[PDB]
């Protein structure tokens, strides 16, 4: 009878139990993911800092100062990524204490009266929050009397953020900009427009006169594909985190970013779901960390972790290529663990610096079929062995046709890039001296090959040494990876795609076409009552003459009318059809 039910227990005015939060895997996941989130946050702040300082300088320069100043900011098509950015802007204007600011979201502006009251109420309550008058009384005149009641012997600016400029109704927005133009000079106003599209929307939505009484200046935050390129080059492909994605999941995430939504936050949520689905298989998956704490967890492990290590498929070739106490008595495998984990982390560090050298080599070339960005060569390299691809063959063909002097200059720029990577990133990391110790003689070999090209056939020797010294050993395919890399890679696209990409259409259709795919019938691979009516109206055209359709249902299988009307009721609950409004006892497919 109630539309709502409560089961409240003990509330007045960390869901999980002790048995999981005690386990190391949640502590490791929280440490690694918090390092990830802090890194991508400071990266977004450093990319935003030019625009934010330009905005604060614009507000202070208008305080240095009737047509109102206003500063549009060309935000991306998605919303929540900008929101915290705007809040930081408010903190800056409460840092220097020259402006107070009320956000003016379009939900609050159904009419001009509502817009003016939320504007005045937000200004007075922002000022009270920096340090309860009636909703019916908060007019602009009270705002003027309150501003001269307070701020005159100092002139704090009156900021009104409009995060969703597109979502506003045009009439209330033009009336609001006209009212704020009427009161500028007496009240120092600035207006910022979060235009989700382009400048044509601002020039088109604002009418002749509203544009005549406005003074707008445009700032640009970075575009979303550029933001995914920066987040992917600088965090998920940064060496110092121990958890690498497989090329399938990597391609799927950049696919969802580039094909459906420009959601940087959606990319962060998908990567957090990948981190959770990998790490939550037990404590054994929490060996995937920095090497010394990994040795402490090597000592820490129990017996279930031994079984969830040993069944991993990539351990299987390692026993193929050869120990009795290793496979049963555990502790001998525990002592063999630093060799495998150390070679694996060594392989991924060598993979990252070798990938940097390769993308620096290929990216200066014209066409770049493999790609000019590190994630592209990353997914092409982890997807399959690169030497068997046609694309590497086209790359070595166009690379073998090069002029010798541009060749030696290009490889010299690649040498400067790889040495900058060797001195500036791998060096703080543990097991970093070992990797430069491994790759540095091969860098010396390509260095001497450079010096003899400085002195035709020689480029084939350079490509052979590139394949032998780098591409075969330290740019391997995911199947060719060193064993028990399964702790450090996440190849499982199936659960992530069925738990991130939702397909209500495909789920309903695969229920109504192949019930055995769900129901696990031993016979139906006996039919469910909905499925026959679904098969029958799928056979039917647009309009449904209901009695001929009903006679087909009588033919395939009184109470038959009850099962049929029950099926059409469940069908029209699903939205597949609707009953005709022009004509009773008749249907229409939707």
């Amino acid at each position: 009878s109630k539309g709502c039910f409560v089961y409240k227990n003990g509330a007045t005015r960390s869901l999980l139990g002790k048995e999981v939060v005690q386990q190391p895997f949640y502590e490791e996941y929280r440490k690694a993911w918090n390092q990830i989130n802090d890194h991508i946050a400071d990266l977004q702040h450093r990319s935003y800092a030019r625009t934010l300082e330009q905005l604060v300088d614009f507000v202070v320069g208008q305080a240095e100062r009737e047509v109102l100043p206003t500063a549009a900011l060309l935000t991306g098509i998605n919303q929540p990524d900008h929101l915290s950015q705007f809040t930081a802007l408010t903190q800056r204007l409460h840092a220097q204490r020259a402006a107070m600011v009320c956000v003016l979201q379009s939900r609050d502006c159904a009419t001009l009266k509502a817009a003016v009251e939320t504007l005045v109420f937000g200004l007075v309550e922002d000022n009270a929050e920096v340090e309860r008058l009636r909703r019916s009384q908060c007019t602009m005149k009270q705002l003027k009397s309150w501003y001269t009641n307070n701020f005159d012997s100092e002139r704090r600016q009156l900021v009104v953020i409009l995060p969703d400029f597109e979502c506003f109704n045009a009439s209330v927005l033009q009336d609001l900009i006209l009212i704020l133009s009427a009161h500028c000079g007496s009240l120092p106003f600035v207006l910022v427009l979060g235009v989700a599209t382009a400048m044509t929307a601002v020039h088109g939505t604002l009418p002749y006169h509203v544009s005549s009484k406005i003074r707008l200046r445009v700032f640009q935050t970075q575009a979303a594909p550029t933001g995914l390129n920066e987040v992917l080059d600088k965090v998920l492909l940064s060496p110092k985190y121990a958890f690498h994605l497989s090329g399938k999941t990597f391609k799927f995430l950049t696919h969802i970013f580039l094909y459906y939504d420009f959601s940087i936050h959606g990319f962060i949520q998908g990567f957090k779901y990948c981190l959770m689905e990998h790490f939550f298989g037990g404590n054994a998956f929490a060996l995937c960390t920095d090497y010394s704490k990994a040795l402490g967890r090597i000592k820490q492990l129990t017996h279930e972790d031994m079984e969830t290590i040993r069944r991993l498929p990539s351990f299987r070739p390692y026993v193929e290529q050869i120990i009795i106490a290793v496979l049963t008595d555990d502790d001998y495998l525990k002592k063999k663990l630093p060799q495998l984990l150390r070679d694996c982390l060594l392989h991924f560090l060598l993979f990252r610096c070798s990938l940097e050298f390769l993308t620096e080599l290929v990216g200066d070339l014209p066409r770049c079929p493999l790609g000019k960005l590190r994630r592209e060569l990353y997914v092409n390299c982890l997807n399959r062995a690169i030497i068997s691809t046609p694309e590497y063959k086209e790359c070595l063909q166009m690379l073998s046709f090069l002029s010798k002097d541009e060749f030696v200059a290009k490889v010299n720029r690649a040498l400067e890039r790889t040495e900058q990577f060797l001195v500036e990133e791998i060096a703080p990391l543990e097991l970093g001296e070992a990797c430069t110790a491994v790759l540095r003689p091969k860098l010396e070999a390509i260095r001497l090959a450079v010096d003899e090209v400085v002195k035709g056939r020689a480029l084939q020797k350079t490509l052979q040494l590139i394949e032998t010294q780098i591409v075969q050993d330290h740019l391997r395919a995911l199947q060719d990876a060193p064993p028990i890399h399964e702790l450090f890679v996440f190849s499982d696209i199936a659960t992530v795609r069925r738990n991130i990409i939702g397909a209500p259409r495909a789920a309903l259709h695969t229920a109504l076409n192949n019930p055995h795919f769900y129901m696990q019938c031993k016979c139906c691979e006996t039919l469910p009552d909905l499925s026959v009516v679904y098969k029958l109206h799928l056979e039917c055209g647009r309009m449904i003459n209901l009695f001929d359709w009903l006679q087909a249902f009588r033919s395939v299988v009184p109470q038959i009318q009850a099962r049929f009307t029950r099926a059409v009721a469940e069908l029209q609950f699903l939205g597949y059809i609707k009953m005709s409004k022009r004509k009773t006892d008749h249907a229409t497919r939707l």
Partner: peptide, 14 residues
């Protein structure tokens, strides 16, 4: 399959 690999490698390595 885990089972055939289990028989093969516990016959081989063990």
């Amino acid at each position: 399959d885990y089972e055939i690999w289990k028989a093969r490698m516990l016959a081989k390595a063990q």
